Structure 1
Amino acid sequence: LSALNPELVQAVQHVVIGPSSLIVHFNEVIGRGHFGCVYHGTLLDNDGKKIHCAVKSLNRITDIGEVSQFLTEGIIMKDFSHPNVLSLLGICLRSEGSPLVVLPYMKHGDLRNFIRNETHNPTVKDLIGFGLQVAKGMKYLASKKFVHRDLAARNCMLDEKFTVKVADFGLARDMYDKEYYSVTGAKLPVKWMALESLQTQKFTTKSDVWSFGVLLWELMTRGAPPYPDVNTFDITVYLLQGRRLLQPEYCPDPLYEVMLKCWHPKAEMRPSFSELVSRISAIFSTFI
C-alpha cells in the first residue's frame, strides 16, 4: 500500500474509513458475489451513531494497478447521490479483508428475491412503484451520463423503508447470480441485453432502457425468469424474428406498451428515463 502513488492516496482520502470507526462481523456471510463475500458491519459516524453496513471484501486483486483503479472508482462512486441509487459509504484499507467496500445495509436484500418471496403480497401498485423508483434512479444515473450495463431486478436492492436502490455498479459491481451470465472476457447478461448489444457488444443509455423494460416484466411476473423456453444462446435470433416477452397476466395494458417501447429495435426510438418516470408515475397513480 506504501507503493501507491501518493497523489492518488491524497485524492481518495475523503472516501477512506479508518479501522477505528468500523466493526465488521467476519464470521457470517450475508451475500456472495463472484468477486467477494459480504458481511454485516457497523460504521460509527462522527456523532458516535451507528450506521449498519454491508461490507464487501474484494478477492482476486493481484497488482498495484488494480488497487489504483479500485481507488479511482471509489472516488467517482462517492460522488453519486440519489435516493434510488446505492451509495458508497467508504472504503477501508487498513483492515483484515482489505480492501473493504463499505455500503449501506439493505434490510430487504435484492429486489428479485424480495418479490419472489411467497410470504408477502406486494400489490400490482407496489410492484409498479418499485419500477418507478428504479426509473428515477436510472434517470439520475443517465443524467450523469453513466451507463449501467447490467440493469436487472437481481441488481437492485431494497432498504428498511422499501426504498429501491439501483445497485451493482462501481465498487459493488459483480455477478450475484451466475446463472444469468455467459462469458474480451465479457460476462454478458444476455436475456436483459438490447438487440444491438447482443450483436455488437456496444452499450448505451438506450440499451439500459431495454434492460429496464425487462426489469418491468420481472416486476409484473414477481420474478419469473425471462424467456424460460429460450436458451441463452438463442435469444438474438428470437428477437430478430420479431418476438418479445409476452404480456404478464396482471400487467396493465399501458405498462405493457411502455415495455414494448423499451424494446424498439431502433435505440433512438426508445423512451428516455425522464419519459419513463413521467409515464410510469401516471400509470402508478391509477391504482387502488
Structure 2
Amino acid sequence: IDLSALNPELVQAVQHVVIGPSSLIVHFNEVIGRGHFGCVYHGTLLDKIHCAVKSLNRIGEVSQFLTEGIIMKDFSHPNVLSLLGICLRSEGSPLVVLPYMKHGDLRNFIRNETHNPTVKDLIGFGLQVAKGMKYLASKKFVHRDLAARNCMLDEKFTVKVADFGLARDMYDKEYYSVHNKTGAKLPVKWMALESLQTQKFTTKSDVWSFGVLLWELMTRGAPPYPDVNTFDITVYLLQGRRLLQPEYCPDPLYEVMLKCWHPKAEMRPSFSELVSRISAIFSTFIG
C-alpha cells in the first residue's frame, strides 16, 4: 500500500478496511460462488465470524481499488450487503471479504422447491430491496445491475442488495449480452429503454430494474421475456409491451411495476415512494 498515492483525507480510513493476513482463514477447498472475475470461498475471520471471500484474479490502480473499498465500507444499511474488508496476499490479487449469506441469492431462493414463501413474504422481499435501494440512491449511488440474482439472503432471511462495488460481477452469464458497438456485457432484460439506447445508467434506470425484480418475485424466479432474444428487447418494448401480471401479483403491485417501467425516466417513482407504496400493499396481507 502506498498511502502517498491516496487522497490525503482517506488515508485514515485504510486501517479500517484492511484485513491482516493472520485475521482471515479462507477455505479455498470448497467453492460457494462462481463469477466472471473470480470465485468466492468460505472464510473464517478472527473477531469467530463466518464470511465469504471473493477472488478477483480471473486489478488496476491499487489506490483506486482501496478507495472503492473505503466508499463501500461507509455504506451501512440492513438491506445493503456490507464490506467487512480487504485482505492483501503477497503472490496474487487482493481478496474481498463479505458477510456470509446463508440462503444464497434471492432468485434461487424463490425458485427453491423446499422453501414456500407466501405472497406476503415475496412482497416483503420486494420491500426490503426497495429499502436497500432507497439507502443507496440517497448516497447518490447507482447500482446498474439490480436483479433478483444480485440480491442475497442471510440466516434471518433478510434481503440485502448485493453485487456492487468490489463485489460486482456477472454471477449468471446467461443474462448478459454483448453490445455491438462497444462490446460491454449488459443485462438487457433488466434495463430501461433509455439505457438500452445510450448505455447511460441512472437511479431512475435502477427503478426500472426494480420493477422487473418485483416481477421475478411474484413469478417465483421465472425468466423475464423468454420468447425474446437479447437486444430485440428494445423493439419488443417499443411495440407497446410490458411484462404481464403474474397470477398472484396484487393489482396495486402490478400498477407499481408499470410505474417503474414508465417511458419517461423522470416520471418513474423514487425508491422512497416505492417503499411507501409497497409497505401499504404489504400491510393488507396476513400470513
Q: Where on the TM-score scale, by shorter chain, does this alignment land: which range?
A: over 0.9
| Structure 1: distance between partners of 2:269 and 2:137 | 13
The normalised TM-score by structure 2 is 0.93
Q: Where do 5+ consecutive residues of structure 1 fail to align?
A: none
Q: CA deviation at 1:5?
A: 9.9
- 2:31 is aligned to 29
Match of 1:15 in 2: 17
* CA shift for structure 1 position 102: 0.3
The Cα shift of 1:7 comes to 9.1
Q: Decide whether the 8 Å contact of 2:129 with 2:161 is kept in 1.
A: yes
Please state whether the residue corresponding to 1:10 is helix, strand or coil.
coil
* CA drift at 1:42: 1.0
Q: 3-state DSSP class of the match of 1:244?
A: coil
Displacement of 1:187 in angstroms is 1.4
- Considering only aligned residues, what root-mean-square deviation do their CA atoms show, in Å? 2.1
Partner of 1:114: helix, strand, or coil? helix
d(CA) in 2 for partners of 1:4 and 1:266? 40
* Corresponding residue of 1:98: 93
Is residue 57–residue 97 contact of structure 1 (8 Å, CA) maintained in 2? no
Quick check: 2:177–2:186 contact (8 Å CA) kept in 1?
A: yes
TM-score normalised by L of structure 1: 0.93
Query: d(CA) in 1 for partners of 2:161 and 2:246?
Result: 23
Residues 247 and 13 of structure 1, relative CA distance in 2, 3 Å threshold: same
CA contact (8 A) 1:19 1:95 kept: no
- Tell me the SS of whatever aligns to 1:149: coil
What residue is the counterpart of 2:50 in the other structure?
A: 52
Question: Unpaired runs of 5+ in structure 2?
Answer: none
**Offset of residue 70 of structure 1:** 1.5
Separation (CA, whole Å) in 1 of partners of 2:80 and 2:91: 28
Please list, as runs of the form range in 1=range in 2, the aligned pairs for 1:224-243 lying within 5 A after superposition. 224-243=222-241
1:268 shift after superposition: 1.0
Q: Distance in 1 between matches of 2:134 and 2:183?
A: 29
Which residue pairs with 1:178 in the alignment? 173
Structure 2 CA distance for aligned equivalents of residues 261 and 202 of structure 1: 20
Give the count of matched residue pairs: 281
Change beyond 3 A, Cα 1:77–1:3 = closer
Asked whether the 8 Å contact 2:5–2:63 carries over to 1, the reply is no
Distance in 2 between the 1:4 and 1:279 partners? 43
Counterpart contact for 2:125–2:159, Cα < 8 Å = yes
State the 1:95 CA deviation.
Answer: 5.5
Q: CA deviation at 1:109?
A: 0.3
Deviation at 1:79, TM superposition (A): 0.5
Percent identity of equivalent pairs = 100
State whether residues 260 and 268 of structure 2, in contact with CA within 8 Å, keep that contact through their aligned partners in structure 1: yes
Distance 1:247 1:39, change over 3 A: same
Which segment drifts farther, 12-21 or 218-227? Answer: 12-21
SS in 2 for 1:282: helix
